[PDB]
Design a protein around this ligand. Structure first.
Ligand SMILES: Cn1c2c(c(=O)n(Cc3ccc(Cl)cc3)c1=O)CN(Cc1cccc(C#N)c1)CC2
Ligand SMILES: Cn1c2c(c(=O)n(Cc3ccc(Cl)cc3)c1=O)CN(Cc1cccc(C#N)c1)CC2
Ligand SMILES: Cn1c2c(c(=O)n(Cc3ccc(Cl)cc3)c1=O)CN(Cc1cccc(C#N)c1)CC2
Ligand SMILES: Cn1c2c(c(=O)n(Cc3ccc(Cl)cc3)c1=O)CN(Cc1cccc(C#N)c1)CC2
Ligand SMILES: Cn1c2c(c(=O)n(Cc3ccc(Cl)cc3)c1=O)CN(Cc1cccc(C#N)c1)CC2
Ligand SMILES: Cn1c2c(c(=O)n(Cc3ccc(Cl)cc3)c1=O)CN(Cc1cccc(C#N)c1)CC2
Ligand SMILES: Cn1c2c(c(=O)n(Cc3ccc(Cl)cc3)c1=O)CN(Cc1cccc(C#N)c1)CC2
Ligand SMILES: Cn1c2c(c(=O)n(Cc3ccc(Cl)cc3)c1=O)CN(Cc1cccc(C#N)c1)CC2
Ligand SMILES: Cn1c2c(c(=O)n(Cc3ccc(Cl)cc3)c1=O)CN(Cc1cccc(C#N)c1)CC2
Lengths: 179, 178, 181, 182, 177, 182, 181, 178, 179
């Protein structure tokens, strides 16, 4: 059960509602059209509190529906707030894409995270390759890698260390403690 | 369901949180990781110097989710007292040993096992990669050499709190509060 | 449905029991029941480390590791603990009952008490770990009943139950009582 | 949906019943039903150590030890206990029914009462043969106690697989009154 | 119950196979493929010039399972008469159009579809490889262009036996013999 | 229904295939599939210690140890083994495919071949991490053995999550011929 | 589908294996697999109490009591027994493999052999019965491998597998071979 | 499925029956009772003097069905050799002890338990009635006193073939044929 | 699996078909409309082999459908052959009725059997009491007890020993060995 915390005059929120107070948005678990709705709702709300106050996106996800992930991505690029993305636990498939789509220089990962841009395996065939050529362009955009490099990197069924993903362009800093 | 205590009224688990106590009950997954990390960061923003007591009674769980909780432990600046009740096995023993040195406790009749019992389908080198991270993290907080960790992590057996204290997993074995 | 009692304030009846320092160990024992009991044990202790807690037990048993944690917390906390057996107390339930403060372990007249372990852990475990559990149970039963290891070992082999009078004679119980004295 | 009434405060209809010192024993009796009923019994005793408690039984039976825990709590508390039988009180339902205070064990006209124990579950774990009859002789004693019938009469009656009318349940010692009106 | 027909006695389907008939019925998988191939190779052993008849009433199935049947049809030397009963969609019509030219028949009420309704989970490039193979096999046997194949194969509709003859899936539409 | 043919005797079509020294490896490879195939392999060897055996593979993979038992039996027997790939030979399917006798490892044109091991079940019991790679290096060795590729090349190729055409599978050392006709 | 081979007579391929005195211990081991193996062991013995029987093993394990019965029958019958490990031989499967006639226990090159018991009986059993099983396994492994109780006890704690060469060195196997010699 | 032996051809279980061998494999119910009794009466009509070998590897079963097989044993006039392999518990140990005296065998590593582990819903006195029949039958074939049976039938434990031979359940403990 | 036995020129039957050769009919397990069909088929067949050669009915049953049991009973009274009924294991509810409906003086039970004429507990109420008043009359017919005695005996949820059932009229002899 989700616990309750008390603020200070006095009011009490559940601890997850309290992270949204600190402009923290959690992207935990697999991604579908409901996670997309919840995340977009919180991303458009925190922009209403301030257009320039940064938002923090915690990503601990194995992937999910591609269109639902693109939906969260398109809302990320839309809003004006900078977004600090934090990779904790793992970020694979659609998860690493939201991770790599943070504001340049604010994409982080904790030391022991695992990062994967390879996509683990009904619509027609050409619509699936349409999706991948989009993911090829987004990953290239934010990593600053070429379409050649992104295509072959997504072929390798394997994970990256935080240091690997940083020197690939996925994230920017690998923190251990607050600076 | 949960009883209600009166101080304003919380339930007994929100009241536990008001005492800076974080429970790690049973199997560990991404939801347990999300809920524990949320309390961990909440407890630090209230005070980065007051310790955080973390109760562990778990048979293990998803390795990444456990590593997620481990890194949040290492991130936050508070002293952290880890407590082992009932058992702490697999990912549970790692969080148990990841407490602040000199503050890792266990109750007398509990059990501790670092043998990893055998979120998506994973290739062979990544399971070896994750097994290697557990090797490093265990050898670091137990001060044991790496060759001693891999051998011990392989005997499919449990340790008594006395045994686990000799190994360097925990520090005190308390029957009552001294 | 859990009813409401109004005292002013309005609790559900189980919350109101905690206002009288009563902790119910009902049904089988898993880690959820363990975590719930320990939460009320550590909470009631901070309300008063010397006011006695009352532990109603009506249980067939449960996970050994989840049960030993409850026992270890009972030995930890400073409060004296009155155990009460209604209905039954079998497997690990009797171990909690026998582990009350000496002289404060009770049972209602028509209860059934068994220390024989039927059939235990959240994970499948090796044969030597199953018996390490059993030898820990032997030590706890010998400690609180003041019986020998020879007697505890052969008593748990009897796939039978004990009357509240037999259990009092064996050492699990102190006072079988039918009315408030 | 459980209705909500208003007495100012507003409970549900069942919390409103408990405020009248009424404890329902509806349906099969298990461990959770036992601790639920027992909690109300000790609560209503703390509010008054001699004000009567009314206990509605419409039960087909259930776990014997769970019902024995309820029976032992009735025997524990000081209050007069007014047991009422509507619909039916079979198996352990009739044990609590007879376990009321002598004089105020009631029933409504069109109910049925059975002391024959149908072969809810019998025990909370599958038990040995000698344990099954240890309970049965415990039931034999508790029945013969509140009926003032001989153990030879309880044993034969519990063998016959049949219900009893409220008037039969009266002439046997199970209950005291068969009311139609107040 | 599969009935018996008669100095010997086979089940009715075993009787059909001595007439050199092969029934591709229902969905197509590796079991259907392994059963059809064992019959295609056996019948060629009896004679590599005697024709073989393939009754097809199929809604489709696994691509690699179907391509194995098609690959075996190309391997064996016998002329192959594909017959379309009820329906032939997805891999079923590709088997139908793979018969010997001039010997691909259809009953007058059948429905044919080359559009593919949307063993291991696989990448997006492997599905497109599959599609390019179904593109080239259709283009090979319907003497149509890859523009005409790719375009028509992505309209979600059925053809009539006369329509399928216009396109090049089959050659003949019999009403009686 | 499995058809019945007539050669006088009359088998089913699959027993008729076995009388042609043809052993099918259809679909996923498990323990029962292994002992079934191995039994045919040793049988066809006793009938003739040097007459070739034809082995049809249309398999997506399966239990590694089960396929390793089949691979070890091919290595055991004396006969030339003619492996054929129709449809696909993924995971351990391509291991047996490459495990044919050098020279007579064939494929049909429209097949696919994958050596990347998809993450049937991997092992017959859930095993430790070091055991999972002990199998993987065993696969690395067996692949590089029959392809005469370096272990560095096998490791990179098995990492890429993709199939290979028969012509790719030829230029890599997996098979020898890509037949369209006899 | 089990094919047919025609010899004249026509058997299914598994029946034809028995004509060559081959007994397949495939898959997990329950009492059905035990009763089937023992039937072919007692039958092949009456055909010739001295012609060797061949025991193909590819098993992850199974019921301990069902497995020990197969072992006891192997020790009973007069025939020498060649054991063969293909694929794997884990838990009780390796115990049958190690219990071949000394000098006639084989394994193909790519097999995996484990004596560590994972996680056993048709009924839930007490902790002392689980270890009595384990101490019987210790005696059988020490007997056939000629290793000591100290080594068998610590080897079964290693949750790992053995190569056919390690198992030959440990005492479970005699001859790893890749071709007919 | 069952292999086929050639002598005419049976399967290996009909071939076992041709050797006057009756299997009692696994749990005992009315179908196992019907099949075993059918072979028992069939074997007697072929010869009421040639012995009948009965293999027991069972965890118990329905008490009535086991009593059904017990009474058919006592009915037929043949000598009966009972064999315990793997285990013989609950109803299984009764049939094991119900063999012809001096001909009850067990293989070395098997287990034997008379503790009855705890066809329609049954009242309390009938379960006591059935428990009493097991008491009498055990005390009769083990020559043990009744008070010794009820105590032993209650320790939730197994006996080694040596133990069960001391108790009087079986007679010989053979490792090979002597 | 049902084993095979060989007769003697030579032919092989399954062991259950071989008991029908010896005019043995098994009534094992619960009774429904299929057991009734099988038993009536074998009872009418053995009468075709001989009108006077006795038939043997083995009964090891807990009960079953009342109408399906009456069906087996009505065929029993119809055929001319005497019927030796043997109670092995148990005979409760409809099972004890077929047991009690054998030829007078040929109803047996082995020593350790359990016998129950009490009926363990969709049609209208009056059709159920119609059924019981039939079972009251059949049990009275063959036991030679009165309707008073049968009604109260079926009230007691309990079993009878073979010696009890013999001295009640249910069976005639309790054998231990062949005479
Ligand atoms: C009416 N409206 C609209 C937008 C907005 O941002 N706000 C301010 C707002 C929003 C939520 C809250 Cl809780 C408080 C204040 C507003 O009021 C933005 N929409 C465009 C848009 C852009 C990106 C993603 C989605 C989705 N899916 C939709 C247009 C309408
Ligand atoms: C915005 N923000 C951020 C952090 C923080 O600690 N606090 C103070 C705070 C936190 C919770 C509450 Cl309820 C009240 C106050 C805050 O406000 C820490 N993040 C970094 C971080 C560190 C370790 C694990 C994860 C994960 N997964 C993320 C960065 C953002
Ligand atoms: C921080 N802390 C700690 C303890 C305590 O008793 N209290 C007072 C308290 C507790 C709950 C509440 Cl609701 C209100 C006040 C506290 O505040 C006791 N812990 C050790 C311990 C002892 C026995 C069992 C377990 C478990 N599992 C853990 C150490 C930390
Ligand atoms: C601490 N305590 C105790 C009792 C009591 O009656 N009251 C007053 C009370 C009770 C409930 C509430 Cl809601 C409010 C006030 C109290 O405060 C009675 N226990 C003995 C007992 C008797 C019968 C059944 C069980 C069970 N199972 C237990 C002993 C403890
Ligand atoms: C040994 N052998 C072989 C073949 C053959 O056609 N015949 C004659 C034969 C076949 C079946 C039967 Cl029942 C009787 C006679 C033969 O004897 C053809 N194989 C290659 C092949 C070709 C097309 C598809 C697959 C598949 N999948 C496999 C090679 C071996
Ligand atoms: C007794 N025996 C043995 C073998 C053999 O090949 N043959 C001839 C034979 C085989 C099957 C049939 Cl149907 C007819 C004749 C024989 O008779 C081969 N075994 C060694 C072996 C080799 C490869 C895999 C396994 C497995 N798993 C086992 C040894 C025994
Ligand atoms: C009657 N009898 C008996 C035995 C025997 O070996 N044979 C020869 C025989 C067996 C099967 C077949 Cl198909 C053909 C001939 C025989 O005839 C061996 N039994 C003792 C025994 C030994 C080892 C395991 C078990 C088990 N479980 C049982 C005693 C009886
Ligand atoms: C007709 N009849 C009868 C019996 C007999 O033994 N035989 C010879 C026979 C039996 C089976 C076969 Cl395959 C071949 C020949 C026979 O022919 C034995 N019954 C008495 C009985 C004894 C013990 C258990 C049950 C049961 N349940 C029944 C009486 C009838
Ligand atoms: C045509 N017919 C009829 C009967 C008969 O007994 N037999 C001789 C026969 C029967 C079966 C076989 Cl295998 C061999 C020979 C015959 O031929 C008896 N039916 C009356 C009847 C009596 C009792 C129960 C049922 C039922 N349900 C039916 C009338 C018809």
């Amino acid at each position: 059960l989700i616990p309750i915390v008390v603020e200070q005059g006095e009011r009490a929120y559940d601890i997850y509602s309290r992270l949204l107070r600190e402009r923290i948005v959690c992207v935990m678990g697999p991604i579908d059209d409901s996670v997309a709705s919840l995340v977009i709702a919180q991303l458009l709300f925190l922009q209403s509190e301030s257009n320039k106050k940064p938002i923090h996106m915690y990503i601990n996800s194995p992937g999910g529906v591609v269109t639902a992930g693109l939906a969260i991505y398109d809302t990320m690029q839309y809003i004006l707030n900078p977004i600090c993305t934090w990779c904790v636990g793992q970020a694979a498939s659609m998860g690493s894409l939201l991770l790599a789509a943070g504001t340049p220089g604010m994409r982080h990962s904790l030391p022991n995270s695992r990062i994967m841009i390879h996509q683990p395996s009904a619509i027609q065939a050409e619509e699936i390759m349409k999706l991948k050529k989009q993911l090829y362009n987004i990953y290239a955009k934010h990593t600053k890698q070429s379409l050649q490099v992104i295509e072959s990197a997504m072929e390798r069924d394997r994970y990256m260390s935080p240091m690997e993903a940083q020197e690939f362009g996925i994230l920017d800093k690998v923190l251990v403690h607050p600076p």
